[PDB]
Amino acid sequence: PNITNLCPFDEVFNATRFASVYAWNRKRISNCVADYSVLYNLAPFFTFKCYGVSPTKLNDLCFTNVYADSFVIRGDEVRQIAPGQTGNIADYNYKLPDDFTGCVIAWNSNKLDSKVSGNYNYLYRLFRKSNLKPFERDISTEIYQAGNKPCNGVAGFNCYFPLRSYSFRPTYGVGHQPYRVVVLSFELLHAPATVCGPKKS
Amino acid sequence: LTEENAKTFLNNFNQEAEDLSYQSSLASWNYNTNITEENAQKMSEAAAKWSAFYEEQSKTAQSFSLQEIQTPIIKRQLQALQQSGSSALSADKNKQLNTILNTMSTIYSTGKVCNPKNPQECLLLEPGLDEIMATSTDYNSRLWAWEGWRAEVGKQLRPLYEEYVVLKNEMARANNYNDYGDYWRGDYEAEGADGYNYNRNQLIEDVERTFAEIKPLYEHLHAYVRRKLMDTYPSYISPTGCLPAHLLGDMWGRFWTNLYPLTVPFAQKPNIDVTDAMMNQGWDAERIFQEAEKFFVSVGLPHMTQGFWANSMLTEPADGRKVVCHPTAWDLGHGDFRIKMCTKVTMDNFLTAHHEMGHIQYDMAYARQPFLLRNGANEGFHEAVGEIMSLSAATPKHLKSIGLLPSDFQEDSETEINFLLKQALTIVGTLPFTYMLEKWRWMVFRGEIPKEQWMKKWWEMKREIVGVVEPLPHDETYCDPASLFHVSNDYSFIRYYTRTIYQFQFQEALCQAAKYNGSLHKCDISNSTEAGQKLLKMLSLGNSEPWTKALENVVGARNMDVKPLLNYFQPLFDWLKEQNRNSFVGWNTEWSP
Numbered sequence: 001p002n003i004t005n006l007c008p009f010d011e012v013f014n015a016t017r018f019a020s021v022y023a024w025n026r027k028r029i030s031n032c033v034a035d036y037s038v039l040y041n042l043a044p045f046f047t048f049k050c051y052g053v054s055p056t057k058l059n060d061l062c063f064t065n066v067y068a069d070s071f072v073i074r075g076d077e078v079r080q081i082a083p084g085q086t087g088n089i090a091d092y093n094y095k096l097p098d099d100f101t102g103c104v105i106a107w108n109s110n111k112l113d114s115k116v117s118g119n120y121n122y123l124y125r126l127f128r129k130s131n132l133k134p135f136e137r138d139i140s141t142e143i144y145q146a147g148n149k150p151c152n153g154v155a156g157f158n159c160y161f162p163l164r165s166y167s168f169r170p171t172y173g174v175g176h177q178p179y180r181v182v183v184l185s186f187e188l189l190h191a192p193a194t195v196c197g198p199k200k201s
Numbered sequence: 202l203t204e205e206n207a208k209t210f211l212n213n214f215n216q217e218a219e220d221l222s223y224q225s226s227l228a229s230w231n232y233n234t235n236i237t238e239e240n241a242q243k244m245s246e247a248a249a250k251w252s253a254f255y256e257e258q259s260k261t262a263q264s265f266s267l268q269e270i271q272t273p274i275i276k277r278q279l280q281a282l283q284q285s286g287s288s289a290l291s292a293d294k295n296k297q298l299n300t301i302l303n304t305m306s307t308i309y310s311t312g313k314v315c316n317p318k319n320p321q322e323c324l325l326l327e328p329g330l331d332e333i334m335a336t337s338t339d340y341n342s343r344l345w346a347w348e349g350w351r352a353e354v355g356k357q358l359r360p361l362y363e364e365y366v367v368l369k370n371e372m373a374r375a376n377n378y379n380d381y382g383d384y385w386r387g388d389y390e391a392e393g394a395d396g397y398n399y400n401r402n403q404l405i406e407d408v409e410r411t412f413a414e415i416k417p418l419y420e421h422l423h424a425y426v427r428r429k430l431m432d433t434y435p436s437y438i439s440p441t442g443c444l445p446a447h448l449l450g451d452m453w454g455r456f457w458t459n460l461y462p463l464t465v466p467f468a469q470k471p472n473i474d475v476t477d478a479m480m481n482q483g484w485d486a487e488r489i490f491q492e493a494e495k496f497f498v499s500v501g502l503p504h505m506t507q508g509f510w511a512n513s514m515l516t517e518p519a520d521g522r523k524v525v526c527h528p529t530a531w532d533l534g535h536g537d538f539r540i541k542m543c544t545k546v547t548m549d550n551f552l553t554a555h556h557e558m559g560h561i562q563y564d565m566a567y568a569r570q571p572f573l574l575r576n577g578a579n580e581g582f583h584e585a586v587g588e589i590m591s592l593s594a595a596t597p598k599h600l601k602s603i604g605l606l607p608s609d610f611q612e613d614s615e616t617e618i619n620f621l622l623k624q625a626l627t628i629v630g631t632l633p634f635t636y637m638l639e640k641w642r643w644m645v646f647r648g649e650i651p652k653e654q655w656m657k658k659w660w661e662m663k664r665e666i667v668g669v670v671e672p673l674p675h676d677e678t679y680c681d682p683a684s685l686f687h688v689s690n691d692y693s694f695i696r697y698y699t700r701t702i703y704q705f706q707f708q709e710a711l712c713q714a715a716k717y718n719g720s721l722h723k724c725d726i727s728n729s730t731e732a733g734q735k736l737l738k739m740l741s742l743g744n745s746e747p748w749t750k751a752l753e754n755v756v757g758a759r760n761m762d763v764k765p766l767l768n769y770f771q772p773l774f775d776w777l778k779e780q781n782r783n784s785f786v787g788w789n790t791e792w793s794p
């Protein structure tokens with residue numbers, strides 16, 4: 001049959017506003033036809049790294065739900081968006097499990113996220129008491145109590161505000177320029193799998 | 202626990218320090234490449250916010266006790282952060298010291314000596330009097346310029362230096378230092394591990410040890426220069442005496458490199474200037490920096506960033522904005538590396554491009570370090586790693602490899618001798634001046650020189666160490682050191698001495714790494730990745746390790762060695778021994794004409 005009703009990847013990838021990595025945006029994707037040749041055929045999407053499934057057989061093997069997680073990090077922290085990695089982003093902002101089935105997509109976004117005055121609208125979590133569980137978010141703004149004295153809501157010595165700004169500027173080096181990352185996580189459940197790619201005649 | 206608290210404190214400090222330091226460096230770049238009042242005031246507020254944040258964090262960092270910190274990288278970061286500097290005094294004394302420093306800077310930048318009986322011919326140092334020191338051959342005009350700038354700067358800077366010494370001594374003793382000389386020698390203090398321990402009080406004797414065996418080469422060079430200047434000035438210079446202070450090619454005698462037309466060995470042999478070859482092949486500044494980048498990727502160090510080519514200025518802009526002519530390599534932070542240089546298509550700017558890109562490569566390599574450890578191993582390392590690239594870039598092998606010099610070029614011994622003599626006038630001749638100036642400043646700050654016997658001491662040691670005599674007797678109302686830029690503007694001067702030693706140490710280590718089988722001054726480190734890796738082990742360190750460890754990583758030694766420096770100048774030293782047989786090597790301390 002002739003196909004319609006493509007999955008809204010234009011809404012996730014071509015969004016005018018992404019999210020900070022501490023409050024990373026999650027969109028569920030179901031009951032549509034997901035074509036992934038849109039993402040591979042664009043050369044600005046530099047990093048297209050897939051885990052558990054091959055990038056070539058994305059359109060035929062098909063799934064129940066697809067989670068698209070969008071956020072912005074810097075260039076050298078894209079490697080932390082992978083199973084089994086450690087760092088600030090992996091431990092405190094966005095954790096993938098060790099059996100992650102999906103793809104990570106990242107591209108440079110200087111013309112959209114860098115300001116000469118400095119983009120102070122992208123934040124990340126630098127301090128947290130314990131590491132994040134996989135696919136967990138923390139949007140809490142509680143002052144990190146690193147010592148023995150109680151913070152009582154006021155910053156200072158041994159009391160730090162945990163969300164620190166990615167002050168993006170266009171003249172930064174390539175490892176510090178803003179990179180937009182979309183993580184596609186594919187899951188199969190007991191439900192009928194309703195996200196399936198196109199076929200031919 | 203205290204160490205984990207210090208780790209989280211440094212993690213909190215690094216991000217705001219990097220952001221504010223980038224803002225300050227970008228504002229300073231925007232002033233330096235675009236001079237106006239709004240860029241100046243923007244630089245002022247950016248530097249004010251960054252300095253205020255740094256002192257605010259340093260007051261909190263002094264609360265940590267270092268006796269319970271085990272990991273030496275966190276301990277070294279907290280050592281770097283706890284340096285309060287000039288903020289250890291009260292606000293009144295700090296404001297008085299800043300007033301003295303600012304009036305010294307604005308009286309050195311506006312120094313003025315004017316022609317007697319010709320009151321319209323008033324000359325500043327920077328445009329016109331340096332031309333007289335560099336070019337003029339008349340004895341009386343040089344005696345005029347030297348004695349006049351000595352008078353109208355020393356008479357105005359003697360009491361300023363009198364309270365400057367006392368305020369700097371109070372600031373240093375507020376930071377648990379013995380004097381301001383020990384505060385400057387604390388830049389060479391190394392505390393990491395065992396066998397890598399370096400002390401401040403050790404440094405002086407090491408410098409003296411390295412002056413124990415540069416002294417014969419300097420004595421032979423001094424004798425040759427004295428004979429050639431006696432050829433220039435017939436009756437005004439004595440064979441057994443010291444050199445007059447105003448015949449040395451500079452204002453202070455700091456560099457002897459302007460004596461090269463007077464002291465050329467072989468005038469019939471031309472120099473190794475390849476400026477006309479750049480003119481004939483249509484080179485521009487972009488090709489100059491591309492050839493420097495080709496050298497740095499042939500040795501194995503990484504390529505230049507795209508932001509380097511995008512953001513730097515490599516040419517006089519000529520679009521109405523005023524710039525500073527001095528080349529400077531900028532590490533703005535966050536992977537931003539720029540070079541400000543008004544590059545003309547000459548050989549000197551080609552070597553300067555190699556030098557400043559060596560600075561940039563040194564800055565790029567320790568970017569993986571934390572923010573407080575993104576510096577040189579000490580103050581001499583950073584300039585030595587640019588001077589070695591300037592050394593390797595000027596060799597005939599490098600110039601023949603890149604087509605600037607023809608493939609059939611003949612390197613006879615005479616051009617090696619006069620090239621080595623020009624290098625000696627630049628390099629060896631500045632070493633007794635540097636050592637004597639820093640020794641004078643150390644003994645002044647210590648109080649070993651009495652306060653009313655300053656000048657009488659200084660002209661003893663320039664008769665003793667440098668072998669340079671005053672032309673006219675000076676009493677204690679003069680302040681003759683203070684006519685120099687680095688001492689009137691509060692700059693450490695031993696970094697040039699240690700630069701000169703570390704430069705030839707690094708060059709011999711890289712040439713043994715590159716397996717060069719000839720004389721050291723002909724050596725090129727191009728197309729040698731193993732020399733680049735031997736270098737980049739030290740460049741990746743920063744000041745994360747003690748500087749003795751980085752020095753052992755390059756040369757295999759834990760201290761300053763001048764055997765590489767004497768090995769560089771060995772053909773010239775043999776030639777100078779061969780032409781000082783009849784003459785008298787050395788000088789006599791009493792004033793001989």
Ligand SMILES: *[C@@H]1O[C@H](CO)[C@@H](O)[C@H](O)[C@H]1NC(C)=O
Pocket residue numbers: 009010013014038039042
């Ligand atoms: C985003 O915009 C480009 C612009 O041509 C378009 O080709 C592409 O299909 C859009 N969507 C995605 C998901 O890239």
Ligand SMILES: *[C@@H]1O[C@H](CO)[C@@H](O)[C@H](O)[C@H]1NC(C)=O
Pocket residue numbers: 235237239520522
């Ligand atoms: C120099 O600074 C002025 C100050 O606003 C600015 O308008 C001008 O564009 C600057 N020049 C360049 C070449 O950026």
Ligand SMILES: *[C@@H]1O[C@H](CO)[C@@H](O)[C@H](O)[C@H]1NC(C)=O
Pocket residue numbers: 499602727728
């Ligand atoms: C270094 O490599 C380049 C690569 O083409 C070559 O042109 C050059 O001649 C080499 N240098 C030497 C000294 O052979």
